[PDB]
Write an enzyme that holds these catalytic residues in place. Structure first.
Site, mmCIF file in Angstrom:
data_model
loop_
_atom_site.group_PDB
_atom_site.id
_atom_site.type_symbol
_atom_site.label_atom_id
_atom_site.label_comp_id
_atom_site.label_asym_id
_atom_site.label_seq_id
_atom_site.Cartn_x
_atom_site.Cartn_y
_atom_site.Cartn_z
ATOM 1 N N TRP A 23 39.062 101.961 52.674
ATOM 2 C CA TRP A 23 38.610 102.310 54.013
ATOM 3 C C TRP A 23 37.324 101.578 54.374
ATOM 4 C CZ3 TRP A 23 39.975 104.514 58.451
ATOM 5 C CH2 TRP A 23 38.978 104.959 59.326
ATOM 6 N N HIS A 26 42.418 106.566 89.618
ATOM 7 C CA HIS A 26 43.270 106.373 88.450
ATOM 8 C C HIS A 26 44.395 107.400 88.390
ATOM 9 C CE1 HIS A 26 43.808 107.272 83.931
ATOM 10 N NE2 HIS A 26 44.638 106.296 84.252
ATOM 11 N N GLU A 27 44.095 108.669 88.665
ATOM 12 C CA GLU A 27 45.115 109.711 88.634
ATOM 13 C C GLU A 27 46.009 109.708 89.868
ATOM 14 O OE1 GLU A 27 43.441 111.193 84.957
ATOM 15 O OE2 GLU A 27 45.244 111.950 85.953
ATOM 16 N N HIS A 52 43.177 112.474 66.919
ATOM 17 C CA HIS A 52 44.493 111.849 66.888
ATOM 18 C C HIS A 52 45.067 111.734 65.483
ATOM 19 C CE1 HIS A 52 42.634 110.542 70.683
ATOM 20 N NE2 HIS A 52 43.865 110.487 71.159
ATOM 21 N N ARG A 102 31.714 115.782 58.420
ATOM 22 C CA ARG A 102 32.791 115.353 57.539
ATOM 23 C C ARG A 102 32.643 115.890 56.121
ATOM 24 N NH1 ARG A 102 31.153 111.664 60.165
ATOM 25 N NH2 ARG A 102 33.237 110.824 60.600
ATOM 26 N N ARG A 154 34.012 104.750 68.593
ATOM 27 C CA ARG A 154 35.114 104.137 69.326
ATOM 28 C C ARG A 154 34.611 103.408 70.568
ATOM 29 N NH1 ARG A 154 39.950 107.595 71.981
ATOM 30 N NH2 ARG A 154 38.467 109.199 71.297
#
Lengths: 597, 194
Positions: A459, A356-357, A487, A151, A255
């Protein structure tokens, strides 16, 4: 000779022509996903541009019809999806600048490298490179260098671009009778025109902030237990009262908490449930995987697969003579064509992936009777929920013993359910506040509520209070941490990952209660029962013709969103966690910081 | 006696379109429907008014062979008592039909890679057709009262749209070559029977 008849004629002409261009736009993309080649690399753009030009001209021509004269809900729903101008309302120079910024943001993220300029061996790719050093490493400085250095280069050259992006998209959104870009992004959940099922844009925040309060209790105990367990690996870096450092969560940002299971196992002496040794020894290949996965869907009453699902589909890596990008995406070519394209390997993570698919193609096969503009799911977080409950019912030891994967007498005890529940909890509960805080930050920064000077203070101010995660080193206003995410660089929404988790447990509880099960919710199954398949299929046929509140009530019986089924599902582990967390300090403190000396 | 030419109506290399459906007057020939049931290729064999067993013991005055190409999920519209984009604008079967409907899959003969757009159909018409009526015209349908003097513009569109036959389309969109045998009894001699 009326507006509702002219609109029907225009819609018939539009519908009976786009089916012949979308199919050819999909076929070239399928061929590209099969073949990475510079020869076919421009067919994608040609087919996309022709279709966009068709769509742009139709959207321009559709503006002549007002929405206040049409009474038919179906016609109004079809016409509302065609009058959305998008970025066509901006000026030419502004549109060109926006397109340049959009095409540069992705390029910088894609072609950004991280290396140590002092040591030659400290260089590696991203996947399976820099994503591997952050996954299976138990060092502190090795992770700190790779966390700070990513970053400081990628996240520092995107700050002017994002600053220009915010002001350009605000003007883009204010020209369409909207307030901001956040109000533009909340227009998917807006339902109007039906009495008794009206939903507004201003109620989503109220619903989410009410659902989070009921959840926080359990996440607090889970965080306390995980922090108590992590004291063994890093005894001189974590405080027993404060928060958890950011670069010790398992991956680049935090995440998912899946990679932390190998260090905080509750019962380490029990053999974990596994089928990886069960498909290699059984000569199970990607063909038989799907040949067996079909029978689970046939048993509940769902139709069979089409003929072209076997011959046109790619299942195995096509050698080295050609390159294929096999990120998880289901392919629906339209016009009665269904195929798949996945990177199959002999592992547990790929068997549930195949299930799942295959749930996705089973869902797309249902609403084929709806028109072209209504051949979609109820909302964005609705398609991914019906394909995930099928994997939850196939990993239990009632079905794994039915297909011969698991042992015929694999004992089910209280020492195996705890191990399964911890693994299930590490991936689901750990991400809800992460999604919530990020979406709240975006909505708060797009509304002008945060000025320039607090663009990066608020933040960490919300990171240290909501998710209980502190930073190892301070950051001034020059950095832009949020833009380092995929994203965020590619401007994708994020609340669809928050709504699906809430919906998938309500669906599962409703279906299993309709399936007449007696016992804990984590052991039940829907197989060998047609009354659950026929209950789900009526909802599956709806498509976009009905509001999502009505679609939810048609199955669950409550037009709102609830967390009670999820709490009941995880109650068995919560009872043991309350017992085991007697000596720990439940809760965190916002005053602690690892660099506060 | 000769063998009645059924190979040019059922095994033709190139069929016609539904809006301009061909019409072959097949009479004074010896029609053999016994080989049709055993062909093991007809994906749909429905006879209205007559039976497959009774088709070889009754002789019709005229056996009119109307041939065209339609979709797979659409063949059910070619029947007495159906509605759609074809049963009122292109070719309407009368409600008192006394014939048979034949169809089979021919994806390997009526599809090429990249597209075969040689078949078309009517999309817009100001009225609905009477049964057994054909009208070939490319007149622009006035959807309002602007009006439009031939230019395809605002609320005025071209009526003829094409068929996108390709090898990889679904079973419900695959070309089902349909020959509608329209048996009828008139006041003229009948000599067409197996």
């Amino acid at each position: 000779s009326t507006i509702e008849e002219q609109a029907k004629t225009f819609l018939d002409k539009f519908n009976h022509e786009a089916e012949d261009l979308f199919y050819q736009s999909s076929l070239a993309s399928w061929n590209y996903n099969t073949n990475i080649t510079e020869e076919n690399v421009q067919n994608m753009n040609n087919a996309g541009d022709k279709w966009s030009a068709f769509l742009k001209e139709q959207s321009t021509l559709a503006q002549m019809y007002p929405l206040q004269e049409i009474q038919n809900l179906t016609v109004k729903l079809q016409l509302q999806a065609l009058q959305q101008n998008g970025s066509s309302v901006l000026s030419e120079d502004k549109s060109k600048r926006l397109n340049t910024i959009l095409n540069t943001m992705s390029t910088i993220y894609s072609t950004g490298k991280v290396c140590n300029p002092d040591n030659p061996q400290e260089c590696l790719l991203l996947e399976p490179g820099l994503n591997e050093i952050m996954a299976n490493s138990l060092d502190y400085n090795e992770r700190l260098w790779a966390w700070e250095s990513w970053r400081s280069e990628v996240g520092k050259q995107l700050r002017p671009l994002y600053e220009e992006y915010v002001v350009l998209k605000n003007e883009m959104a204010r020209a369409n009778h909207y307030e901001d870009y956040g109000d533009y992004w909340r227009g998917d959940y807006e339902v109007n025109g039906v009495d008794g099922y009206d939903y507004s844009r201003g109620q989503l925040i109220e619903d989410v902030e009410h659902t989070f309060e009921e959840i926080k209790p359990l996440y607090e105990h889970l965080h306390a237990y995980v922090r108590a367990k992590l004291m063994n690996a890093y005894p001189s870096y974590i405080s027993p009262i404060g928060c958890l450092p950011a670069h010790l969560l398992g991956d680049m940002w935090g995440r998912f908490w899946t990679n932390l299971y190998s260090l905080t196992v509750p019962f380490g002496q029990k053999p974990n449930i596994d089928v990886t040794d069960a498909m290699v020894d059984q000569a199970w290949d990607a063909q038989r995987i799907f040949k067996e996965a079909e029978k689970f869907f046939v048993s509940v009453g769902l139709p069979n697969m089409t003929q072209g699902f076997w011959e046109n589909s790619m299942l195995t890596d096509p050698g080295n003579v050609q390159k294929a990008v096999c990120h998880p995406t289901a392919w629906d070519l339209g016009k009665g064509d269904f195929r798949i394209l996945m990177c199959t390997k002999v592992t547990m993570d790929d068997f549930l992936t195949a299930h799942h698919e295959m749930g996705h193609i089973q869902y797309d096969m249902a609403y084929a009777a709806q028109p072209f503009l209504l051949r979609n799911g109820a909302n964005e977080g609705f398609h991914e929920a019906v394909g995930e409950i099928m994997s939850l019912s196939a990993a239990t030891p009632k079905h794994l013993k039915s297909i011969g994967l698991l042992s015929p007498d694999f004992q089910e005890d209280n020492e195996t359910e705890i191990n399964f529940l911890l693994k299930q909890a590490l991936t689901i509960v750990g991400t809800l506040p992460f999604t919530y805080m990020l979406e709240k930050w975006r909505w708060m920064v797009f509304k002008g509520e945060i000025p320039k000077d607090q663009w990066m203070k608020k933040w960490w101010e919300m990171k240290r209070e909501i998710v209980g995660v502190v930073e190892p080193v301070p950051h001034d206003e020059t950095y832009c941490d949020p833009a380092s995410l995929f994203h965020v660089s590619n401007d994708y929404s994020f609340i669809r990952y928050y709504t699906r988790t809430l919906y998938q447990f309500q669906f599962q509880e409703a279906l299993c209660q309709a399936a007449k099960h007696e016992g804990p919710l984590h052991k039940c199954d829907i197989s060998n029962s047609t009354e659950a398949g026929q209950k789900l299929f009526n909802m599956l046929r709806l498509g976009k013709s009905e509001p999502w509140t009505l679609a939810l009530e048609n199955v669950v019986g409550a037009k709102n969103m609830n967390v009670r089924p999820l709490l009941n599902y995880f109650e068995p582990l919560f009872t043991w966690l309350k017992d085991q967390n007697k000596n720990s300090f439940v809760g965190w403190s916002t005053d602690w910081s690892p660099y506060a000396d | 006696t000769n063998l009645c030419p059924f190979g040019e109506v059922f095994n033709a290399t190139r069929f016609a379109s539904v809006y301009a459906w061909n019409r072959k007057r097949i009479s004074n020939c010896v029609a053999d429907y016994s080989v049709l049931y055993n062909s093991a290729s007809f994906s749909t064999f429905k006879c209205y008014g007559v039976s497959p067993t009774k088709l070889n013991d009754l002789c019709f005055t005229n056996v009119y062979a109307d041939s065209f190409v339609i979709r797979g999920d659409e063949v059910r519209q070619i029947a007495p008592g159906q509605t759609g984009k074809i049963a009122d604008y292109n070719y309407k079967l009368p409600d008192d039909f006394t014939g048979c409907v034949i169809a089979w899959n021919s994806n390997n003969l009526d599809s090429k890679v990249g597209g075969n757009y040689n078949y078309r159909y009517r999309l817009f018409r100001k009225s609905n057709l009477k049964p057994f009526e054909r009208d070939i015209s490319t007149e622009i349908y006035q959807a309002g009262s602007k009006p439009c003097n031939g230019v395809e513009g605002f609320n005025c569109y071209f009526p003829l749209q094409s068929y996108g036959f390709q090898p990889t389309n679904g079973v419900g969109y695959q070309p089902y070559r349909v020959v509608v045998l329209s048996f009828e009894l008139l006041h003229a001699p009948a000599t067409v029977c197996g």
